[PDB]
Amino acid sequence: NLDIIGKRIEKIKQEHETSWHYDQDHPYKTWAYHGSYETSSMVNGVVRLLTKPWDIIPMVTQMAMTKEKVDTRTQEPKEGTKKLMKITAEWLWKELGKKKTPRMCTREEFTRKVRSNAALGAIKWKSAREAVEDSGFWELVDKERNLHLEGKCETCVYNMMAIWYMWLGARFLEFEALGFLNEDHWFSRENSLSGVEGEGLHKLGYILRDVSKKEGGAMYADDTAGWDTRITLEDLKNEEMVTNHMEGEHKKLAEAIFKLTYQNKVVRVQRPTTVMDIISRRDQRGSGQVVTYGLNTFTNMEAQLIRQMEGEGVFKSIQHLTVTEEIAVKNWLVRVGRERLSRMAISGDDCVVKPLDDRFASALTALNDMGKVRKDIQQWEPSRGWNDWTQVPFCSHHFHELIMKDGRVLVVPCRNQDELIGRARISQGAGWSLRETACLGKSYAQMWSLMYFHRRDLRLAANAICSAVPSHWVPTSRTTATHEWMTTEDMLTVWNRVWIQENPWMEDKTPVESWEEIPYLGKREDQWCGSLIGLTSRATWAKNIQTAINQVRSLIGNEEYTDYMPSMKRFRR
Ligand SMILES: Cc1nn(C)c(C)c1NS(=O)(=O)c1cccc(F)c1
Ligand SMILES: [Cl-]
Ligand SMILES: [Zn+2]
Ligand SMILES: [Zn+2]
């Protein structure tokens, strides 16, 4: 306890020795308190000017305007549960490890990742680049590094905002020890069977249709209420077992990340009463986002195999596993474990499961005792399943089967169109030039052309934005699945590569010659999913689109533009 976290606290105490007090009106119950000390979404004008009909749709316009789950506790699982998790976790790290080798990630790999801008959850230096291009940073890194090899920590402290930011250094040390899980694709579908890491939104619907082809019961897609808060100290121990597969320095650096920063956290939170609270806890998820995704995927795979074992009668009670049950659990994993992984699609806390039969629906004792309580259903009410893979929610989408005029089959991603338009009208951060705002609009437009071409309004609005932004300007994002739309290559060429040439579910490789060969949803179904077709507002927008394109061209100025509208039958004379 205080031996592991004391140093980090001690060091914070001294930097604010002027202001340190044990505040007695501290609002924490489950978070151990230690002391205190004194300390918006912007609109994208390019996308909004080209989506006028949505200016009067509150579900779009309200998206641009504007704890009691973190400060909760999770009971210790029973002995039977703890044994089921330990056996399953041991088995799963071995399967994931059969064709992969754990290894340290490099300064070079980190330096490259920071010099191409990604989600790093980081807070003497300004930007990430400067610190990476400074030897002093690496000496600070080196000091903590040697502290970790010595089994101690001084500067690895979380800052809450839920996202848990760290100083780049602590983030580097995290990356060095555990970055291999993402960098070497441990959660790819090929390696994990249930995972979808690196798949891409143009593959997820085909993956759910392949799960639907298995014999068995309904498709279950239960969401957990606040997954990150429900990660138990036991879950963190089972995750730590990945270190059993490591050696040398790597093994020691990884054991220190798990022991010192995951299983024993130190956090700073702003309270308006404005003070800084220094709190600690031993449970809950609070890594960096990328490691969080891989370990969430691992623990979710483990939890869903145990729920499958429960439905199949492999064990009778979570109170205690008998000696023979243990062997039966091990024998089930060796005999059918890989087949049962193949019946799932798991993306962090998000799952779809097609079990052997519907006994799964009421197999709730292990799931509830592991702390993975289902959202929006009563604790002991059986899960409701989906009879049709096209209705299943996954990764905030559903999926349509769409038949091309030439007979070939596309499985396409979809979500309510108000959500798509409302997100594309939002930027994050300050100091955006008009060029940078235009290039972010172009990134949304090209994503729409590639993923949501089947939605009449989005194909039209994507064509308009690409016509309104200079043809050679490069799409950008400030935080960056696989992003095939992030390119200045011709979008028809990219569509053909993604949906025909490289699509393993498409046997006929005949290229598509124009956008008019690429189908839409049915008119009614397109309207079900939030299309504004059949509204006078939408008809006037579509008719007068060249006027809207010309307004934006006039703002940006005298640049080289292409007209993409004649790619659509209605503007093609
Ligand atoms: C020109 C038009 N104006 N109106 C009022 C309607 C029904 C149409 N036809 S439509 O093909 O655009 C269409 C739109 C929405 C749903 C649907 F099933 C069909
Ligand atoms: Cl259904
Ligand atoms: Zn540390
Ligand atoms: Zn849809």
Side-chain angles (χ1 to χ4, degrees), residues 1-65 67-573:
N1 184 355
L2 260 184
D3 44 340
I4 292 178
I5 56 179
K7 192 177 192 64
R8 273 171 284 179
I9 306 175
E10 284 164 38
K11 169 166 198 287
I12 294 158
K13 216 180 171 193
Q14 296 181 29
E15 300 154 84
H16 308 277
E17 190 79 48
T18 29
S19 309
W20 194 263
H21 55 285
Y22 201 116
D23 185 335
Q24 283 293 346
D25 293 325
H26 78 244
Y28 305 115
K29 194 45 188 248
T30 73
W31 283 83
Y33 174 72
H34 296 279
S36 299
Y37 78 77
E38 173 148 1
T39 45
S40 85
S41 51
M42 315 295 291
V43 178
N44 187 323
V46 168
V47 176
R48 180 153 68 176
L49 278 179
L50 296 170
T51 55
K52 190 180 196 192
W54 294 270
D55 291 349
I56 62 163
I57 306 274
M59 294 291 321
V60 167
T61 62
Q62 312 258 30
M63 296 186 38
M65 306 303 286
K67 198 197 301 166
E68 301 55 33
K69 201 160 211 175
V70 71
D71 202 349
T72 70
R73 212 203 70 189
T74 314
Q75 175 163 37
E76 178 99 318
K78 305 276 178 266
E79 293 297 301
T81 309
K82 284 189 291 202
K83 180 63 72 182
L84 289 162
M85 293 191 294
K86 238 82 191 186
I87 295 169
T88 305
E90 165 176 327
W91 178 85
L92 189 61
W93 285 126
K94 289 196 179 88
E95 292 298 308
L96 290 175
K98 280 189 201 161
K99 296 172 284 154
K100 301 275 178 197
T101 304
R103 60 89 186 179
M104 288 189 301
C105 292
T106 66
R107 310 207 163 181
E108 295 65 3
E109 269 178 320
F110 191 73
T111 291
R112 194 151 54 105
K113 291 184 69 70
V114 310
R115 288 218 278 264
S116 41
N117 315 359
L120 300 167
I123 59 183
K124 180 50 202 165
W125 308 281
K126 172 202 319 169
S127 60
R129 284 182 172 85
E130 308 176 4
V132 153
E133 308 174 356
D134 180 321
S135 306
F137 175 76
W138 299 106
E139 313 179 29
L140 300 188
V141 174
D142 279 313
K143 194 185 175 200
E144 261 281 277
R145 188 144 172 197
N146 287 287
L147 289 179
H148 286 184
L149 296 170
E150 215 189 334
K152 307 157 198 258
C153 189
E154 193 180 65
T155 62
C156 308
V157 164
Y158 291 110
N159 311 42
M160 205 160 264
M161 257 146 94
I163 310 80
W164 304 33
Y165 296 86
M166 262 176 156
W167 88 281
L168 201 57
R171 211 89 271 172
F172 170 71
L173 284 185
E174 177 186 72
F175 176 75
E176 182 167 62
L178 293 185
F180 74 90
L181 288 173
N182 189 250
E183 288 300 313
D184 306 335
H185 309 293
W186 277 50
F187 298 104
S188 65
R189 196 153 190 85
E190 177 177 357
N191 193 63
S192 66
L193 306 191
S194 302
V196 295
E197 192 274 308
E199 281 313 308
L201 181 61
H202 58 289
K203 307 254 281 214
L204 299 184
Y206 287 109
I207 288 165
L208 291 188
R209 182 184 69 168
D210 277 352
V211 169
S212 87
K213 286 170 183 161
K214 296 229 167 211
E215 297 296 317
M219 295 184 72
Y220 296 85
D222 290 345
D223 278 344
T224 302
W227 174 273
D228 283 357
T229 80
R230 306 301 187 116
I231 286 285
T232 63
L233 182 59
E234 195 73 358
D235 292 328
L236 298 167
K237 285 177 187 178
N238 294 306
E239 288 169 9
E240 198 263 357
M241 285 204 309
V242 65
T243 59
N244 295 351
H245 295 270
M246 300 173 186
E247 67 188 44
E249 231 174 51
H250 186 203
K251 180 171 165 109
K252 288 293 140 148
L253 289 173
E255 283 172 0
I257 294 301
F258 281 107
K259 258 207 180 51
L260 302 177
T261 68
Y262 291 176
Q263 301 177 9
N264 281 281
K265 322 179 169 57
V266 169
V267 181
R268 66 173 72 169
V269 187
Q270 284 226 329
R271 191 156 42 108
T273 66
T274 289
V275 301
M276 189 67 76
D277 307 10
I278 296 303
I279 51 169
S280 83
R281 84 168 306 114
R282 296 220 56 215
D283 76 344
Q284 304 199 349
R285 175 76 69 219
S287 321
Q289 317 169 201
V290 175
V291 175
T292 293
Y293 175 86
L295 296 181
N296 282 349
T297 304
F298 181 85
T299 294
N300 204 5
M301 287 169 66
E302 177 200 298
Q304 305 303 322
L305 275 176
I306 291 166
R307 184 170 175 186
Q308 292 193 66
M309 286 172 205
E310 189 168 341
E312 283 176 45
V314 175
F315 68 94
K316 194 167 162 289
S317 164
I318 59 166
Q319 234 66 33
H320 160 87
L321 241 55
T322 74
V323 295
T324 63
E325 276 168 327
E326 285 178 21
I327 172 266
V329 170
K330 296 179 177 68
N331 285 346
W332 188 88
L333 287 173
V334 168
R335 180 176 73 263
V336 300
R338 288 180 69 84
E339 190 283 1
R340 299 299 192 272
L341 288 175
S342 66
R343 290 173 166 277
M344 312 195 284
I346 304 184
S347 195
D349 66 356
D350 206 358
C351 62
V352 175
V353 185
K354 189 163 178 175
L356 196 69
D357 54 58
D358 289 314
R359 288 179 290 174
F360 181 97
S362 47
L364 298 169
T365 64
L367 189 73
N368 281 333
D369 194 46
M370 293 181 294
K372 309 303 184 282
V373 170
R374 293 163 306 151
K375 202 184 45 165
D376 293 346
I377 191 161
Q378 303 171 278
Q379 190 153 237
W380 299 111
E381 185 68 15
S383 292
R384 55 196 168 272
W386 303 86
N387 300 124
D388 165 12
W389 69 268
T390 64
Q391 313 302 301
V392 169
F394 187 53
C395 293
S396 309
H397 290 74
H398 55 283
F399 302 86
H400 295 259
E401 217 175 33
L402 171 61
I403 290 171
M404 294 179 71
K405 273 165 273 153
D406 70 21
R408 300 178 284 183
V409 182
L410 302 165
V411 180
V412 301
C414 194
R415 59 197 286 186
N416 178 274
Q417 193 184 260
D418 291 342
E419 299 173 12
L420 290 175
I421 293 180
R423 300 162 88 74
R425 290 164 53 131
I426 290 171
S427 176
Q428 303 290 330
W432 293 75
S433 73
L434 179 52
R435 172 163 187 155
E436 209 190 345
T437 305
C439 288
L440 178 60
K442 186 167 178 177
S443 307
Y444 277 99
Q446 293 196 161
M447 170 178 89
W448 288 357
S449 302
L450 200 56
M451 301 298 104
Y452 309 120
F453 47 90
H454 54 85
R455 306 309 305 288
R456 293 164 175 77
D457 297 350
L458 299 186
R459 193 189 302 193
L460 198 163
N463 284 327
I465 293 159
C466 290
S467 304
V469 175
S471 67
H472 299 281
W473 287 9
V474 178
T476 50
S477 206
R478 269 192 209 175
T479 78
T480 75
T482 83
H483 290 214
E484 273 98 347
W485 59 87
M486 297 295 289
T487 177
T488 58
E489 184 162 32
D490 168 288
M491 283 300 103
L492 188 64
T493 300
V494 180
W495 189 101
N496 269 297
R497 188 184 298 125
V498 162
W499 289 104
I500 305 308
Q501 187 202 132
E502 303 185 344
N503 178 357
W505 292 275
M506 191 64 79
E507 167 157 28
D508 176 352
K509 301 304 188 185
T510 303
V512 148
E513 293 299 331
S514 79
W515 282 99
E516 313 215 9
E517 286 183 64
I518 294 172
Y520 298 109
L521 298 188
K523 285 184 287 168
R524 185 180 291 278
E525 293 168 299
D526 201 348
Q527 188 184 55
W528 277 327
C529 287
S531 187
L532 296 201
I533 53 168
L535 309 190
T536 277
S537 56
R538 191 283 186 197
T540 307
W541 170 70
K543 190 173 215 311
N544 296 317
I545 198 67
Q546 293 291 340
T547 301
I549 288 165
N550 287 342
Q551 182 181 31
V552 172
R553 288 184 173 162
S554 298
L555 292 173
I556 292 180
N558 188 32
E559 289 295 337
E560 186 189 343
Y561 306 92
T562 309
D563 179 17
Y564 293 107
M565 306 317 289
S567 67
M568 324 191 73
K569 184 158 87 284
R570 66 167 300 152
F571 305 111
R572 208 186 36 88
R573 304 305 306 171

